[PDB]
Amino acid sequence: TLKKSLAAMYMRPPVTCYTDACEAPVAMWDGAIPLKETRKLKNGVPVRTVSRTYSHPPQLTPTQLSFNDINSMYCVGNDELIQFFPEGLGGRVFQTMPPGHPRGFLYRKETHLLNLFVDKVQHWHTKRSVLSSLTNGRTGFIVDGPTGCGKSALMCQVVHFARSRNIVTLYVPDAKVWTHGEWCWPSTILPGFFDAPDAARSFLKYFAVANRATLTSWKLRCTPKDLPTEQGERQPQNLYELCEWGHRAVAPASIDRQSVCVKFLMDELSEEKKLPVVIVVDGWNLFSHETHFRYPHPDFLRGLASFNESSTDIDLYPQELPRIPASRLSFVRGLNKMILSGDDPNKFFITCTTRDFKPFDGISGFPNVETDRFANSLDEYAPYDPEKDSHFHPIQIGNFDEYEYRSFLRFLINSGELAGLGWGPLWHASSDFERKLYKIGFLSGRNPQGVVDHYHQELVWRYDYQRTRQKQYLLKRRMEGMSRGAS
Amino acid sequence: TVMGKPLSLVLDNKAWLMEMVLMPFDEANLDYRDFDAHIVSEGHAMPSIANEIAA
Amino acid sequence: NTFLTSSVATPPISVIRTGPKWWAHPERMVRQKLMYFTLGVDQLPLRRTAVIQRDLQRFHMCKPPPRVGDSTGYKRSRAAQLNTWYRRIQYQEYHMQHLFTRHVWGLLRVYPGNTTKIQGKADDGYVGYDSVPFHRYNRAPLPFPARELYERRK
Amino acid sequence: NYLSEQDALYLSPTTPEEARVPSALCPQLSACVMVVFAANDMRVHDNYALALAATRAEAAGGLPVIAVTVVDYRMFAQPSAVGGFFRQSPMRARFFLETLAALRYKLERELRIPLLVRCGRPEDHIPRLVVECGAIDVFLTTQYAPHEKEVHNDIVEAINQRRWVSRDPTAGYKAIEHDAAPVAHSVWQTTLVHIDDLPVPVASMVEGERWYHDDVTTANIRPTAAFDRCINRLSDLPARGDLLPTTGELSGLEPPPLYRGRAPTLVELGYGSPEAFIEEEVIATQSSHPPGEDAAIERVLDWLMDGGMTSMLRYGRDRRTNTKMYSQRLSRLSPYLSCGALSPRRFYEELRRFTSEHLRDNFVQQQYREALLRLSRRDYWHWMGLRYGPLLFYEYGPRPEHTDDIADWRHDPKIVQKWCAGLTGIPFADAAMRELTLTGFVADEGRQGLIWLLSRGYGQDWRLGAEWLERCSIDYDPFVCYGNCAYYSELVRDDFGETVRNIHWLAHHHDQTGIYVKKWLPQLSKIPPVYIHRPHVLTERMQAMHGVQLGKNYPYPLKLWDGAQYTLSSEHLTTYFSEGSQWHRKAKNGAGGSGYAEALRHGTVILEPHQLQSSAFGELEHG
Amino acid sequence: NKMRSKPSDNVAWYDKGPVEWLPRPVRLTYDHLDQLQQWTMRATLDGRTEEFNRIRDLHREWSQHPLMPVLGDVEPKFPLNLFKQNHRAKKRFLVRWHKANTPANWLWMPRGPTVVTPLHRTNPTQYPENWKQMVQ
């Protein structure tokens, strides 16, 4: 009767933001998230009211984040997420935030360090000496670690920090779409260079809508005034106008405009010396090495009359030409130009390395299409050493420790139950949090991707007898209690 | 570690197979992260031993 | 999807009777849970059938209790009631799985197998590149460019 | 529009070269002997017209044989007289077209006889083709039914008078232009006992089934070997290979030559919105009807071999008992006998041979006599329909003297809709209607139950039920169907015959266990046999135990019990044809499914609309 | 050996429920899961919540707890005949019964506006996308 009274008398707290709004009805998380009566002095009299024992982590802006928030969970509003991430998130970052679930992030030591670094970059001319000391003379940092770490999530956090401080930021959430893209096309104005039209058009559109506030104030310094323009369309005087011109076009004319817009945008950024620019590429190891595209067969570049007598084998035997290096891409060329060339103290590359390659451990049969978690994984099988393959300072990121793992798992389980994505009414079917924390830690090894996977895989646990034993014990207790009452 | 590879990789990160290996450390009321264990395969070697009987 | 050939249909009772081999296969159940979670909806029927399958598989080895001690008047009827209730819950989960698979196919522009219905854009069973020139169950002749269900771009 | 374009293509004053039968090369082959096929006969084994044409060609010399079949376009897409039902529903139309294709294959590949298929008016197409081909003798069977007897008379008159037809207006012309005095031979081959052999005249025939059975006891049946010999010798006659289809045409790579003809389809005939004509129910029966003549012969042989003779009478009984409508041992030969693919003489010869072979058994003679009795009953219904003439299709039956107790035929569109959709409360009637709507065939007891329930049980007009059975049943014989409907609607009340039994009596008699109802409506499987045939009697507890919730599934009966207006409300009495019903949500535009005024709602080609039809459509729109 | 044009029991019904009854088997892969994740990310970034609302409505309609069957309510079983093994008859009976038992005619599932579902939000306005509309 007491629990029924608590559920009936529970009153939902006032909604303050998206994080407070996402909350399932009381009957969903009644058992998963218990309730207790607390005395609150609403009018100086401690009226006893029913309140939850758990709440979603606070939604704290990057400025509000401080040293005391390290190894703790915070949330970002849905509108703030939309405004600051038009391109998207990392390859596997968004898996933990469905529409009902709150968007939450863990504030780690590296996250705090990069947040301070972005704060110093905000006014880079005054803090130039300390920034150079932090990067040891390199043009930014590169995050490296094993598969499953918080690498992509850290890059998303850095983008959030840069966007919240009104800094021009290039974001490539998935570098696979450039190197291992759908198709490749030679550059129209750059001889000997290629590009991926699909990724480039998306990059132009999303960069425009992200920094529209700043790119409109940006003025064109190295850009011709005779750009090809259709009737009724205004000439671009701002960088945002240039980006809109490049991406908003009817096919196939958008291909050539995009190939031109990327070249001119790179020139405009390269000719900037007073504004801090942050460039975040998730998976820079793909740009370091060659792309999966191969050079066209030369017989496609001369024309044939008949296949019989033409000294050609294009139609008879497929052959592998040397793969096109990423350094010949237009986007990559501009990045490499800004890196290798000096006198660029305002551009900082906060990049990362992806290790999402397909597994290969000596023998490789044919993976089952029905069950294969690596359907979209890269077919690289290539070792990568950031020290020898990047000009940036390498930062090594390992798996979660005990504190971060506990905070991450507590957020996942309890926020999911509160949002209506957990056991809910079947809370008693699974063990308590301590058993979950212990068991999942063994299953995953405190690898953040493993933690998420085993959090989902908890549904099929078979050998967890904690709840079954408790049910028998409590039933035995109540049977004895009833017998004592009768006697 | 099983045959020089982590248990998660040997069982292909399957919770319903790794929980069987975890069970003795729960029934004995011990801690899994207090002992180093290695498994040596001496029967018929197969590319994948991710199954209930092998577990 | 990648499977586009002709398919036969089986009663839901058969798939439910199939225990921890196809219906209760933990990997398949985890995939269904991921499908529900990425759509941001609760997995209550999936968890119900999961706990039912766990309880059934844990004690499938044990011999049944003596039926002579059990009262055929009441105990057998109670057991039948519980079995039917579990079977109905599993039926609901099976139906939900099929419905959400069709919905996700329609959203993701995934062409299903032959004679498979996707509500909203097929409504009569999409068939393409089949052994029979005519559409099964409809007798409608089929073109060679079978059917463009979705828009071209992307 | 398809009929108009067919008329403008073929029935044109000039008859363009594309729609012209090629002339023969040899001067002898210029003339030929033509045969007309129809829905009454699509066989090549016992066709009297075919045998007579073969004999005529043999007597004349090397005269070729030509076959023509013109489909009656009106019968496939025109609405019914009462209630606007379809005529030749798509289920029947597909079977008809498949049988026509089988006949064409039989004639062109086995007998090497080119068959020319035409679409439109038979009375227009046939004489014009006679004139163009220069046929000397046109052999055809005698149709004696309305819309068939009149067209046959017009055809023979136009053949005698050598009349050309142009169809911009209804205009006829002499044979002076054709840009030999032909004779038409009309032969009687429909009845098992050929006319002019009856022991008593039709005019002075006493109206009685048992009297006709006693007459057929003395009457003889013509053999089939005499006509088979002529059919076999037909092959020796020279044939015009230019009219035969080619390998590409057989493979379907190119359409048939325009002078030959193109088999029409459902859309070409006029069937619109096929999605509304797809019945999504469980087909409990496990036997089908493969259209054709060889298939019909194989079905006859298999039914004889597998012990199907017990379907007539159970072994060692000598008295008719309740039938097993759920069985697969029944001879489903009524479609093949009504469409003419299987000849009654051939079926009788098969029965006689089987009985003679198994005569060592002491009961096969009784079963043979029962089968002959059923065939003679079909012939008797034919004779009674001929006697009644046009009066058979009028209100209150042909004989108003027997209709003293009949009411004034109250007609309700929604009641007719529920009856034709099977949404009644009687499990036997529902199962019979489901079987008829799905398979296109149901047993004699099911037909009796349905017709009696619609006519006398509910008070609705009997013509509505007769036309619905015409629309559904693939074995629709006009005379047999309408005569049985009149007899079992208590319109024709001839004594010394089968009694008209209640639907409840039929359910208790032929389906006492309820296998048939529990098989065709498997949602009622849990109801005990004591409570089947009356599931509305169950209380709430009993219906929850047996898993049959009235109103949700298997609604309440059309005929509520005494009271039932104070203890029931709209929550229990669920509607099935309101504005927000599934029936409206069909046809991909929204008009309805299958039922009242379905031809008006779905059909594309409608000719001569009626005031009653328009008023019914307006009432349906308002409601 | 014999060729039959009989419509087998494997005929699908494309007018009873969003999913055809006796549905064809479906193979849901991790490639499909990844594509769904990408699509959901793009949709939520664009701000179109109509598809999510429709999905939530479908889940609310078809994801309710079945009711407790009264004693005596059980699926029909096939009788034990002495005519050997009527495997085909058993299969036909089972398929026919399950085809008749369409999801629309599932009486144990509480479906419709009349029933109350105290576990899910009734309308899209209650969902957190309308957090600005529920303030102070």
Add this chain to the structure above:
Amino acid sequence: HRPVKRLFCNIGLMGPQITTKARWKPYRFATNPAGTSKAERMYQRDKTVYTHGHN
């Protein structure tokens, strides 16, 4: 189909996607003539010619 696939592999502008992501028509469906528009075309080819499905 064979030379088309080989040309797509040789050009390399699409990459290794031809056999991993690209989908192709079946054998007897992709051996149809240029303009068919009907799935009932492979059954309408010449049968007297013994050519193992090559018209």
Add this chain to the structure above:
Amino acid sequence: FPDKYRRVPMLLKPQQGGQQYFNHFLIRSTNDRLTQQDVDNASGQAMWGEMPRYTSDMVFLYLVSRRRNTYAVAYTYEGKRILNTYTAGNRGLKGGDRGFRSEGSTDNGHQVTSMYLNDLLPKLREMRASEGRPMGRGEKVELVVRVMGFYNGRQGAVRAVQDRANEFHVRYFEDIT
């Protein structure tokens, strides 16, 4: 017939998990018992005779069950036939699909009697209204049941007449040999 899992050990059929929780449960039980003792101590410190007399409005119903048949008939007090006899053969149940053994069974008698009563009620109302005797809005007709035969259909017939007790009220239940 043989055991399917004979090769599995008894300790494995089934295996008891959660052995580590038993000690904790025992200690918790000891603590709970101790605090229960503590609170208990705290509370302690703190023509004539038995022959029926008929009425002119009561209808005599006769139910005659046979070895392979059953009959239900009714008569008014004057001695007129309200409705003709309803038999199993008349209803069609005797025809077949169940065998001669099922003839005159409990369910058969029940359904025959139910059909006869349902057809009797409007006929009875018409008969009453013929002589200007309305039945009234609430139909409660008194009938005397007379059962004969000693067969299986007798139980079905008496169950059927017990049914619809709102319309039919049994006044005397007599048996005739």
Add this chain to the structure above:
Amino acid sequence: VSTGEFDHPPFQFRQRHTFNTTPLHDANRFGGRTAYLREIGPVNIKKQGRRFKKDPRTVQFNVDVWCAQQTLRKRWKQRDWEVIEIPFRLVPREQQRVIPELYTDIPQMTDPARNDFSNIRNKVYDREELQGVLFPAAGAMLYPPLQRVDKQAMTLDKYL
């Protein structure tokens, strides 16, 4: 280890496409290589049918060779190096030794006295240091010197 399949499924009665069952030669298996073994359509064994597509041994060898090709390509994709013959005088001390042939000795180790125990046959040397030996005549500035990060430097990662 590996997770995919290496053995062809066995020959049984015809597998119908349903739940937990796939046709034996469906296009999904082995990527798409069941096309070689697929005998399309219903086959009358009396006359129609190739023997090798039904022989369980030949199809097994075909599956084995396909898996071997897959293993070879996946192994060769790991190669980010080439083998160059050096005149034995310019190699470092860790290479100036008697290196045994493959499969003729226990796996050797590079200078175990230098706390290095890695396999000697899997050592890969970058060109940033070998340009002097590889291209003596070229000289000039080819492959500019590889910058090596200073470990003992107070950068951001050192919590400066």
Add this chain to the structure above:
RNA sequence: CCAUGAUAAGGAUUAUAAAUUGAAAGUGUUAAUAUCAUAAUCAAAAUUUAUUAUUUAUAUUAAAUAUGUAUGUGUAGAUAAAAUAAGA
């Protein structure tokens, strides 16, 4: 032309509770067939001759000559098989 042996089909029942990881498949007969120990006029190279458990729709003939005809909504009747590392 040796009539005599095997085989096919094929079943039986004690193991309480604790411990232990343990302590757990057995065939008559009736049948058909056949190449053996038993009774002389004729099968094994020139094979058409009809002898149960087969590959069904992204890619399909290279090493001893190695299968061109049955797509039809997978739709009958009969027949066989198992409680065996599986999950009635």
